[PDB]
Amino acid sequence: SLRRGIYHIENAGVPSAIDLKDGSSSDGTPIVGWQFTPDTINWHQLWLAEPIPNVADTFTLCNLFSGTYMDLYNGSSEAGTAVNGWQGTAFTTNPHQLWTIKKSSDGTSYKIQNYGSKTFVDLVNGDSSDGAKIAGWTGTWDEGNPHQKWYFNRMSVSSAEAQAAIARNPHIHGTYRGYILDGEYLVLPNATFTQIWKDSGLPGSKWREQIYDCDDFAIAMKAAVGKWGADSWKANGFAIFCGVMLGVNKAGDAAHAYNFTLTKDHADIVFFEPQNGGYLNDIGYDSYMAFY
Amino acid sequence: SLRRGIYHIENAGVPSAIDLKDGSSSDGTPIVGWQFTPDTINWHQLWLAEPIPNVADTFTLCNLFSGTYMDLYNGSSEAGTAVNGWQGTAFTTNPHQLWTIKKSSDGTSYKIQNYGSKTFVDLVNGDSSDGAKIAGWTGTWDEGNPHQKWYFNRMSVSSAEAQAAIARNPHIHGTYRGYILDGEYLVLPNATFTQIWKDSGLPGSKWREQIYDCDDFAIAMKAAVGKWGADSWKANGFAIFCGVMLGVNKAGDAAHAYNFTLTKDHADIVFFEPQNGGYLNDIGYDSYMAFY
Ligand SMILES: C[C@@H]1O[C@@H](O[C@@H]2[C@@H](O[C@H]3O[C@H](CO)[C@H](O)[C@H](O)[C@H]3O)[C@@H](O)[C@@H](CO)O[C@@H]2O)[C@@H](O)[C@H](O)[C@@H]1O
Ligand SMILES: C[C@@H]1O[C@@H](O[C@@H]2[C@@H](O[C@H]3O[C@H](CO)[C@H](O)[C@H](O)[C@H]3O)[C@@H](O)[C@@H](CO)O[C@@H]2O)[C@@H](O)[C@H](O)[C@@H]1O
Ligand SMILES: C[C@@H]1O[C@@H](O[C@@H]2[C@@H](O[C@H]3O[C@H](CO)[C@H](O)[C@H](O)[C@H]3O)[C@@H](O)[C@@H](CO)O[C@@H]2O)[C@@H](O)[C@H](O)[C@@H]1O
Ligand SMILES: C[C@@H]1O[C@@H](O[C@@H]2[C@@H](O[C@H]3O[C@H](CO)[C@H](O)[C@H](O)[C@H]3O)[C@@H](O)[C@@H](CO)O[C@@H]2O)[C@@H](O)[C@H](O)[C@@H]1O
Ligand SMILES: C[C@@H]1O[C@@H](O[C@@H]2[C@@H](O[C@H]3O[C@H](CO)[C@H](O)[C@H](O)[C@H]3O)[C@@H](O)[C@@H](CO)O[C@H]2O)[C@@H](O)[C@H](O)[C@@H]1O
Ligand SMILES: C[C@@H]1O[C@@H](O[C@@H]2[C@@H](O[C@H]3O[C@H](CO)[C@H](O)[C@H](O)[C@H]3O)[C@@H](O)[C@@H](CO)O[C@H]2O)[C@@H](O)[C@H](O)[C@@H]1O
Ligand SMILES: [Ca+2]
Ligand SMILES: [Ca+2]
Ligand SMILES: [Ca+2]
Ligand SMILES: [Ca+2]
Ligand SMILES: [Cl-]
Ligand SMILES: [Cl-]
Ligand code: NA
Ligand code: NA
């Protein structure tokens, strides 16, 4: 079963993503196929899948930027029916906004079925051009048709996944304790993480004994990423990944405070030095505490 | 012996504080007696006492706002010699900026003796008016003269003192761990702590599930107080007191993130709710983690 999380949803036949046109929160905004850039934030193309209680393999899909929901227009089972963004809520009973999402016969991509109509999300004619219609269409679960097949490229981690990545790192102190603050996190490309750092003012901050020293830099970076998250996205129910760590050197006589992020494959952490914007696989300290 | 820390230094005969006139960093800026407001930040009247290694009861005194040092003009032992702010460093060997500070014969106030001249800091004629001269003057350690006696009202806590205040609180979870980040902290009046909160933008922030929830508010408040500290004071070697706590309710099924500060007497903590600006002796949670 697809796990709760944020996804970039890519057609299996052509490299078009499911895109809420212009990110608009207006009701009836078309959802279309559009090209994308890997290892970026694709601002109009991220979707938060919320599982519905007690209803197997069925979800709402909330666009991260707009806060509005994937909606089959008037629930029609007619082939060609518009799929649009529309106001709703995460656990709605409106079948127009409920989607059963299960693996296709290729075992890798998924099909996306409206719970009311039993029709499928379809990139009409497999058209790869920017702005191509997506519609609800007749189909079957088992058929090959790539117009109706979608890769769910996972862009978030659960808190358990983040904890795993930390735990496999080789620079963790024997006394380490982690303090988990949220449940599901958008993982930033480093290019975005860096942009947040630049825009925070931290690049120009001077180190000062106690009054603006390593701990201040690290906390400020975290606060900046938290502020970015709220100011950037209208959906709720997720956080942005950015940790703080305290660590001690091998000799045991010096401590440091710094940040960390996750690799692209989500399997490992990478340390960030907020005093200079550097990413490091080894910062010279073993973490004894983290919060994220 | 006087402990390292930040002090408001008040004459024992009249309620005038040692004030660096207009907070000016210019060399030769007069240090004068001036009236003060209790339970405020007295912006030009705070002094960081740094003990000198191996030199008993002797200190530099750094004005917190200007970053410049109490300086006996040309080290003269003549009565009437100007005491002024002047550029220097925390561990200087310049005797003009070194001060032996020991209790007076009243056992409560201190006398302040220049290490080079052996003369004493003197509120000339005990004049209580705003801008009254302070000078180096002949004197003795044991005499009663209130012109040369000074109360060192302690405005900072060491990290050990903060840890003690936390440890005597009744709302600490059995699993509590604290993570200390600095050594010496200016304690804010609540009126200042609140002003920082107001100026941070947090009063207008909306709670949002995971993306701007309790943990974000608490971290943001801490970051705001850290930024205020650096932007407000030119001296180094101290931090501003502002903690973050994570806590769990009595039933064990809900957690919260919030801030804390210290009472005026420095002996107890007080919880601050960054979602509404409230101070509470009981926030409804027992702290399982704190960083400060
Ligand atoms: C059958 C119809 O269902 C609901 O209306 C839906 C729309 O539902 C969504 O938007 C409306 C506002 O237009 C409202 O906010 C609702 O809570 C939300 O779920 C929407 O799905 C459109 C497009 O497919 O179709 C229907 O208009 C309900 O509001 C109506 O009263 C009625 O029961
Ligand atoms: C090229 C074409 O691919 C398949 O047709 C698709 C459509 O397939 C879906 O609709 C048809 C009915 O129109 C039938 O229900 C099929 O099982 C279902 O997957 C649909 O994807 C549309 C819009 O994108 O495009 C193509 O017409 C195939 O069935 C056709 O025979 C033909 O090979
Ligand atoms: C004997 C004299 O001592 C030092 O000069 C002091 C001044 O010292 C302070 O300021 C100067 C700049 O004016 C410099 O930054 C120095 O490091 C700092 O300690 C000051 O104490 C004034 C007023 O009392 O008196 C003397 O000018 C030293 O710089 C001189 O070379 C000389 O050794
Ligand atoms: C009212 C006055 O108080 C004392 O005189 C002080 C001064 O005291 C200091 O200087 C005198 C020499 O001028 C002597 O060295 C004394 O031990 C020392 O404390 C001084 O504080 C000045 C400037 O503020 O004011 C007064 O003159 C006392 O000695 C006088 O007899 C007289 O009672
Ligand atoms: C926020 C906005 O994002 C980009 O434009 C989006 C656009 O983004 C996708 O397509 C462009 C090419 O048009 C690139 O492949 C991006 O990597 C994709 O994410 C689409 O989402 C459309 C339709 O909704 O809206 C545009 O606003 C970017 O080109 C803009 O500069 C801007 O940053
Ligand atoms: C930063 C500045 O602080 C206050 O003026 C200071 C002044 O502050 C002291 O005296 C005033 C009365 O003049 C009150 O008692 C304050 O509680 C004291 O802290 C002195 O430090 C003088 C001389 O150095 O400089 C003034 O700038 C305040 O009145 C100003 O509004 C302002 O906030
Ligand atoms: Ca949370
Ligand atoms: Ca600090
Ligand atoms: Ca520190
Ligand atoms: Ca959060
Ligand atoms: Cl088939
Ligand atoms: Cl006497
Ligand atoms: Na830097
Ligand atoms: Na509020």
Author numbering:
A (entry chain A), B (entry chain A): 2 to 293
The authors write:
The different orientations of Z-VAD-fmk were defined as ‘direct’ or ‘inverted’, depending on whether the VAD peptide was aligned with (‘direct’) or against (‘inverted’) the standard backbone orientation of a PLCP substrate. In the ‘direct’ orientation, the inhibitor molecule extends along the MOA dimerization interface, interacting with both protomers. The carbonyl group of the aspartate residue lies within hydrogen bonding distance of the backbone NH group of the catalytic cysteine (3.0 Å) and the indole NH of Trp208 (3.0 Å). The aspartate side chain of the inhibitor points away from the catalytic cleft, and forms a hydrogen bond with the backbone carbonyl oxygen of Ala256 (3.2 Å), which also engages in a hydrogen bonding interaction with the Asp backbone NH group (3.3 Å). The adjacent carbonyl group in the Ala-Asp peptide group interacts strongly with the solvent-exposed Ca2+ ion (2.3 Å), replacing a water molecule present in the calcium-bound structure of MOA. The side chain of the alanine moiety of the VAD peptidyl group snugly fits into a hydrophobic cavity lined by residues Leu247, Ala258 and Leu182# (‘#’ denotes a residue provided by the symmetry-related protomer). The carbonyl group of the Val-Ala peptide group contacts the backbone NH of Ala256 through a water-mediated interaction (Z-VAD-fmk-Ala3(O)/HOH: 2.4 Å). The S2 specificity pocket of MOA is defined by the P2 alanine side chain of Z-VAD-fmk.
The proteolytic activity is associated to the C- terminal α+β dimerization domain, which closely resembles the consensus papain fold (r.m.s.d.: 2.2 Å), including the Cys/His catalytic dyad (Cys215, His257).
